[PDB]
Design a binder for this molecule. Structure first.
Ligand SMILES: [Mg+2]
Ligand SMILES: [Zn+2]
Ligand SMILES: [Zn+2]
Lengths: 49, 79, 50, 49, 1226
């Protein structure tokens, strides 16, 4: 309902198909936070699947 | 208009596993993969799942058996 | 016109509504007679007299 | 404001906490029908195209 | 797709890794084409294309040729969204230190060389040189020098002697430094030399060294050689209305850095002097540091605006912005808000939702359900169908709402009940209907308050809103077992009105068949409602094996209570409807209903009670008028009497018989004792006011005054407001607290005069502001609580400890405040509790002490129960279900997965918004002294000699129902173990808080006047004369005797010199320090202290919270510890407790521990997860530190998950995490 550029679209396209099921992704605010931290002299990363 | 799920919890009293199991079953009835086990008195899949839980004819174990059956069912159609 | 809650006075003192209601009831009761004597078109004597 | 004939008495909890219970006669005589004036303007301005 | 978040140092090459280009020209969009410039801050070639799947040049537009860098511009035609992922870098000319690694309190570059900060800051500003790698010369490897010092220094040693100035020097010093050899040397300096001074910084410098190596990142990276730039989409330049462009401050700062770096390079190739280039280097450092963190050097302002521009780090921390206003709290779709109103007709599970609101909300459901039923060709057509408001779509909406729960939220969310799920009820208009029974839990009124609605999407969120959040599932609060659903104003008033009786009601004393006939009498208008009529009523009571048996018979009652009996459920008897039925009575009736018949019956009972209440309270008249207030005709006298009682005191002070602060109390006491007269004048005249003839005999009964019934029912009017209503309202005091010798003398009915209203105005202002400005205080407290709690969840089945805290009733002073049954109910036993006779079993080792065992232990004289707690539980990164208890919206054991930390923090945070001679034994029994030394004197009676002395009362049962303290040298008249009569005075002597309080209690703050403690038994002794303070030696008995201390002589003592005093004795008076309570006593004593103290401030006013919650906070406060020895081992308590005990299972020796006491804000500081810390704590610091250490977060907790947007490892998320984590790492 807030972030996840794909989450909003997928949920909306599902709600009309009679299927009430979310496909959670990654909150865009958090990717922006990763940018703002990594643009500094700080290196933040993610590891395994 | 399901108001209280007290008896529905009594079968699996964990208050959360109830939601997980009822969601699996509600999917089965909503995202077309199965049929209802209780006369659907216009009740939404959300409530019908809880009713199946109440009657004691649906839970984690029973659904785990049914899905396991359909696992081999999907392999008995490829010669 | 409006129906308030009596329980809403005795907590927050606010007793002004209590007496505003009584004085207003009287102030409208006088207008009742004014309007009656205006509708009954009695005369200009009772008007001043009251 | 306006002159309203008030009567302190409960009424089936319709006023329960601080809510107010008003007669239909009031809303009929248009004695509280306040008028409003919104001001919405359109702006045709030069664009990149 | 990920299960680990790591943070490490950014290397000058790892930066060039991400960067997709080197921004050279400090430019932007062109000026006339609005197009990005080559190598600028928005260069499409460096970052990304302007349009979607289109190049800047315009040669490649089709979506076909995607991966290709058009040789025209170098812009790879791709998704324009990539302009948000496209990093960049800048080739800085002169080296530049990262401000974060130099300005943070533990200055990273600072103690990385043991070099004081004021030195490096002088080196950076080019105000002093510094030696580097001298080898064998007159100078060291790290030494400072000035202009004239560097002048005749290169001549002495041209080679082998290097000494630079500025950032180059700091960097090259960090490059040639050995973070390995130096470490091996700092090991012995901590080994031999004593004197904490030799161990202050060393014990923290060795750690920085070894961690700097273990992580892997090198010290040279402390200096940014390459500055990474931010994608242009995170700092847009987008246009706006009117043509004006809206940009970010990040741009201005970046542009500045680029300008100055370019200027420096131009000088370096233009052959400029040093006075110019050294100024340029400092300007560059200034701009870079202000770009990373603006407000630590000089607060570089922005352009035309005077306000300082916001830098990078500023876009992360603070309550505003990221991490607090973005990742923990965001706005959400599928929601709304509106002004809420009444709605009695609604059931306790449903709420009225405005029609148009539902339409707009469920738009996505409506469209699909329409296109499915063959009513809309495609989605677009369904949109127009609902946009036209065609008739069919209303029925469609009614079909989609049907069993689809929604969520309602009240603006301040104190406890969990602030958000509750209801079943939609379509309604006309625009107002939101709310159920009155829930207004208490929500803590909302109908004076204009607004509430927000939220529509679930997944089938899960729809089930959790039915089996977890639904209204009828949350009846009894988790904080205290008392139901949160109790009748409010009108309901209790109607019921109390029915359950009344006067004496002479129309047709009283007769008999009827039952409720049917009694109602036939009332409605017909033949009988009254308050008649004392006695009738027959069948009271069902399931007995003897669980079989329902209806025993019908006649009882004494009223026509009204018998009618109300028609609502009462089956199992409940008739004794519940035989009283005045006040609020405090209706509530307990409903409670017994709940724990007799179950949830399902209690719900319908509450709904019925509400409907009937409102109806009757309405038709009872039940109003208020000016005449209702009964001004006591004695008022006039009672006033003038006490008004002249000061006329003698005035002359007493005018002559000199009493001084100022002496006749002040002479006025205050006569006025306070005269106010009871005027207050009781209307009271005893209003509690028996109505006078009627019983059958023909005049008699007075409980008055029927409109104002008074509202009090005796507890509906609205309390007691004090009555003394204010009819009589004068007290005396006010100025902010000083100087109560004025000029009380109010007029009441509210008569009307206050000008003079009297001023002091009322101050009182009003103090109340108003003190309550308004207190909002943030309580909010802050509960916020820090939740930040100390979250990660604490119920996971383990059973820990396996018999430890248990020792539960004893509060009994203090006169009478008990809270019996043992309450502080033991629903908990778990630690050791088998027996009858007063030894070797018995009243209860086994550990069992749920539900109501049954409560009654059973109440039968016996056992007033001491050993109950397991959360403060003591063998569990790693969690708690075991048994140690916690059971308390919830159900009486069952706490489930495996509910996050008890958050609910406890809320259970303490919601009640926060409400806060701001001799002895005479009562009961009969036997005097039982405790811990007292006595001696016979002249009178022959007994006298106390020990300061501390407890006075228990061993009755014929063997329990304690009295506990008094008596000071030194008391008068005793019985002795220890002596019989007493009905209140015999056995004691005599000569006697010669709020929310800021609980804040201190939790923060473990050191008291202002501490009290020393004993460390061992033995006779105490004095020592050296008064030098600065004083001395005091400890004389143990058998073991070693090296203990002593210095206690100032300016601080009086209490302990006896030639007397044995065990450890933890009162060496002085004054408050007590919890840190000193952990060491000399233990882990259970301190928690038993904090709970007993914090419970008092809440016990003062009408607040009740089970000790369990506060126990969870105490347990979170001692999660850290200090190690005594080293042992066979190579801090956190759980981690070392498992890691050393696994080798202690092995024959290898273990290492001892010592619990440390960290406040709720100091414990929330240190946490395994660094992200959760940097979420609320000082982000800028937390990240710097957890970055040099290369710390690695696996999130394992709540806030971190809600940050990355994942199912929280608790509750419904704990089951998913169960199934995942099981096969994970295995
Ligand atoms: Mg309000
Ligand atoms: Zn091109
Ligand atoms: Zn435990």
């Amino acid at each position: 309902k807030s972030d996840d550029v794909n989450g909003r679209t997928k949920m909306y396209k599902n709600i009309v198909d009679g299927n009430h099921q979310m496909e959670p992704g990654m909150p865009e605010s958090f990717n922006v936070l990763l940018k703002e931290i990594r643009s500094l002299g700080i290196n933040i990363e993610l590891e395994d699947e | 208009a399901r108001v209280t799920v007290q008896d529905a919890v009594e079968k699996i009293g964990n208050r959360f596993d109830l939601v997980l199991v009822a969601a699996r079953r509600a999917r089965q009835m909503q995202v077309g993969g199965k049929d209802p086990l209780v006369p659907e008195e216009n009740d939404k899949t959300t409530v019908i799942a809880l009713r199946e839980i109440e009657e004691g004819l649906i839970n984690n174990q029973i659904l785990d058996v049914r899905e396991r059956q359909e696992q081999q069912e999907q392999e008995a159609a490829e010669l | 016109d409006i129906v308030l809650n009596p329980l809403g006075v005795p907590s927050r003192m606010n007793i002004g509504q209590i007496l505003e209601t009584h004085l207003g009831m009287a102030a409208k009761g006088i207008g009742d007679k004014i309007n009656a004597m205006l509708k009954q078109q009695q005369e200009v004597a009772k008007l001043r007299e009251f | 404001g306006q002159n309203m004939r008030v009567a302190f008495m409960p009424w089936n909890g319709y006023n329960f906490e601080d809510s107010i219970l008003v007669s239909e006669r009031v809303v009929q005589e248009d004695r509280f029908t306040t008028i409003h004036i919104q001001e919405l303007a359109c702006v045709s301005r030069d664009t990149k195209l | 797709e990920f299960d680990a978040i790591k943070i490490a140092l950014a290397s000058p090459d790892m930066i060039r890794s991400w960067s997709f280009g080197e921004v050279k020209k400090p430019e932007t969009i062109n000026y006339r084409t609005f197009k990005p410039e080559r190598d600028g801050l928005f260069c499409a070639r460096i970052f990304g294309p302007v349009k979607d799947y289109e190049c800047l040049c315009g040669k490649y537009k089709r979506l076909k040729h995607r991966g290709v860098i058009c040789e025209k511009c170098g812009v790879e035609v791709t998704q324009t969204k990539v302009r948000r992922e496209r990093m960049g870098h800048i080739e800085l000319a002169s080296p530049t230190a990262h401000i974060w690694f130099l300005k943070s309190l533990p200055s990273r570059i600072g103690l990385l060389l043991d070099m004081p900060l004021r030195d490096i800051e002088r080196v950076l500003y080019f105000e002093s040189y510094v030696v580097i790698e001298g080898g064998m010369t007159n100078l060291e490897r790290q030494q400072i020098l000035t202009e004239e010092q560097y002048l005749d220094a290169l001549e002495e040693f041209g080679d082998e002697f290097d000494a630079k100035m500025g950032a180059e020097a700091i960097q090259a010093l960090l490059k040639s430094m050995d973070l390995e050899q130096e470490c091996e040397q700092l090991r012995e300096e901590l080994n031999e030399t004593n004197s904490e001074t030799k161990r202050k910084k060393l014990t923290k410098r060795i750690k920085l060294l070894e961690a700097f190596v273990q992580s892997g990142n090198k010290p040279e990276w402390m200096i940014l050689t390459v500055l990474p730039v931010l994608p242009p989409d995170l700092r847009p330049l987008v246009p706006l209305d009117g043509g004006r462009f809206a940009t970010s401050d990040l741009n201005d700062l970046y542009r500045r850095v680029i300008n100055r770096n370019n200027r420096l390079k131009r000088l370096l190739d233009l052959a400029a002097p040093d006075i110019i280039v050294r100024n340029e280097k400092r300007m560059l450092q200034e701009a870079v540091d202000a770009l990373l963190d603006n407000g630590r050097r000089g607060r570089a302002i922005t352009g035309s605006n005077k306000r300082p521009l916001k830098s990078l780090a500023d876009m992360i921390k603070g309550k505003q912005g990221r991490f607090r206003q973005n990742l923990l709290g965001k706005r959400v779709d599928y929601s709304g808000r509106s002004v809420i109103t009444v709605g009695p007709y609604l059931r306790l599970h449903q709420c009225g939702l405005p029609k148009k609101m539902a339409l707009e909300l469920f738009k996505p459901f409506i469209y699909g359900k329409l296109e499915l039923r063959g009513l809309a060709t495609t989605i677009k057509a369904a949109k127009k169908m609902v946009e036209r408001e065609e008739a069919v779509v209303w029925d469609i909406l009614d079909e989609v709402i049907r069993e689809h729960p929604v969520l309602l939220n009240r603006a301040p969310t104190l406890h969990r009940l602030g958000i509750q799920a209801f079943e939609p009820v379509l309604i006309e208009g625009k107002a939101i209907q709310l159920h009155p029974l829930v207004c208490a839990a929500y803590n909302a009124d109908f004076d204009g308050d607004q509430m927000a609605v939220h529509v679930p999407l997944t089938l899960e969120a729809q089930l959790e809103a039915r089996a977890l959040m639904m209204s009828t599932n949350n009846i009894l609060s988790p904080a205290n077992g008392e139901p949160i659903i109790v009748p409010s104003q009108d309901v209790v008033l109607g019921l109390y009105y029915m359950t009344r009786d006067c004496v002479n009601a129309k047709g009283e004393g007769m008999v009827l068949t039952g409720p049917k006939e009694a109602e036939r009498l009332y409605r017909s208008g033949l009988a009254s409602l308050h008649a004392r009529v006695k009738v027959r009523i069948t009271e069902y009571e399931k007995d003897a094996n669980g079989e329902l048996v209806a025993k019908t018979s006649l009882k004494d009652t009223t026509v009204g209570r018998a009618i109300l009996w028609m609502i009462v459920p089956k199992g409940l008897p008739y004794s519940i409807v035989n009283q005045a039925l006040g609020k405090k009575a209706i509530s307990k009736m409903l409670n017994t209903c709940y724990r007799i018949l179950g949830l399902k019956p209690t719900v319908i009972f509450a709904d019925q009670i509400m409907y009937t209440g409102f109806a009757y309270a309405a038709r009872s008249g039940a109003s208020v008028g000016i005449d209702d207030m009964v001004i006591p005709e004695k008022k006039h006298e009672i006033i003038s009497e006490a008004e002249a009682e000061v006329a003698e005191i005035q002359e007493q002070f005018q002559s000199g018989l009493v001084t100022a602060g002496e006749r002040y109390n002479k006025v205050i006491d006569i006025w306070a004792a005269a106010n009871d007269r005027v207050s009781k004048a209307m009271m005893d005249n209003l509690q028996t006011e109505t006078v009627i003839n019983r059958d023909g005999q005049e008699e007075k009964q409980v008055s029927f005054n409109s104002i008074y019934m509202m009090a005796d029912s507890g509906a609205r009017g309390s007691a004090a407001q009555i003394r204010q209503l009819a009589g004068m309202r007290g005396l006010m005091a100025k902010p000083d607290g100087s109560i004025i010798e000029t009380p109010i003398t007029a009441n509210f009915r008569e009307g206050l005069n000008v003079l009297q209203y001023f002091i009322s105005t101050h009182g009003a202002r103090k109340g108003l502001a003190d309550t308004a400005l207190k909002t943030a205080n309580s909010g802050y407290l509960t916020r820090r609580l939740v930040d100390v709690a979250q990660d604490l969840v119920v996971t383990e089945d059973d820990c396996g400890t018999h430890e248990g805290i020792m539960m004893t009733p509060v009994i203090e002073g006169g009478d008990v405040k809270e019996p043992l049954r309450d502080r033991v109910l629903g908990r778990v036993t630690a050791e088998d509790v027996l009858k007063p006779g030894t070797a018995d079993i009243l209860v086994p080792r550990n069992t749920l002490l539900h109501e049954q065992w409560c009654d059973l232990l109440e039968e016996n004289s056992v007033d001491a129960v050993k109950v397991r707690s959360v403060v003591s539980c063998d569990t790693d990164f969690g708690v075991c279900a048994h140690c916690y208890g059971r308390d919830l919206a159900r009486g069952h054991i706490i489930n495996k997965g509910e996050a008890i930390g958050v609910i406890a923090a809320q259970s303490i945070g919601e009640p926060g918004t409400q806060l701001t001679s001799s002895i005479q034994v009562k009961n009969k029994g036997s005097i039982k002294l405790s811990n007292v030394k006595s001696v016979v004197n002249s009178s022959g009676k007994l006298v106390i000699t020990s300061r501390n002395t407890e006075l228990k009362l061993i009755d014929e049962f063997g329990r304690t129902k009295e506990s008094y303290k008596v000071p030194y040298g008391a008068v005793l008249a019985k002795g220890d173990g002596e019989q007493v009569a009905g209140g015999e005075t056995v004691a005599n002597w000569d006697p010669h808080g709020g929310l800021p309080r609980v804040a201190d209690l939790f923060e473990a703050r050191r008291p202002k006047e501490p009290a020393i403690l004993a460390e061992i038994s033995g006779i105490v002794s004095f020592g050296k004369e008064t030098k600065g303070k004083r001395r005091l030696v400890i004389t143990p008995v058998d073991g070693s005797d090296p203990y002593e201390e210095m206690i100032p002589k300016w601080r009086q003592l209490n302990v006896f010199e030639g007397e044995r005093v065990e450890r933890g004795d009162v060496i002085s008076d004054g408050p007590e320090a919890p840190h000193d309570i952990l060491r000399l006593r233990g882990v259970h004593a301190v928690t038993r202290y904090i709970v007993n103290e914090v419970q008092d401030v809440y016990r003062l006013q009408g607040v009740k919270i089970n000790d369990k919650h506060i126990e969870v906070i105490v347990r979170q406060m001692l999660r850290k510890a200090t190690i005594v020895n080293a042992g066979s081992s190579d801090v956190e308590y759980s981690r070392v407790k498992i890691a050393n005990r696994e080798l202690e299972a092995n024959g290898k020796v273990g290492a001892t521990y010592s619990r440390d006491l960290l406040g709720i804000t100091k414990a929330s500081l240190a946490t395994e997860s660094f992200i959760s810390a940097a979420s609320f704590q000082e982000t800028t610091r937390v990240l710097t530190e957890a970055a040099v250490a290369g710390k690695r977060d696996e999130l394992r907790g709540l806030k971190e998950n809600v940050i990355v947007g994942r199912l929280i490892p608790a509750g419904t998320g704990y089951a998913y995490h169960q199934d995942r984590m099981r096969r994970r790492a295995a």
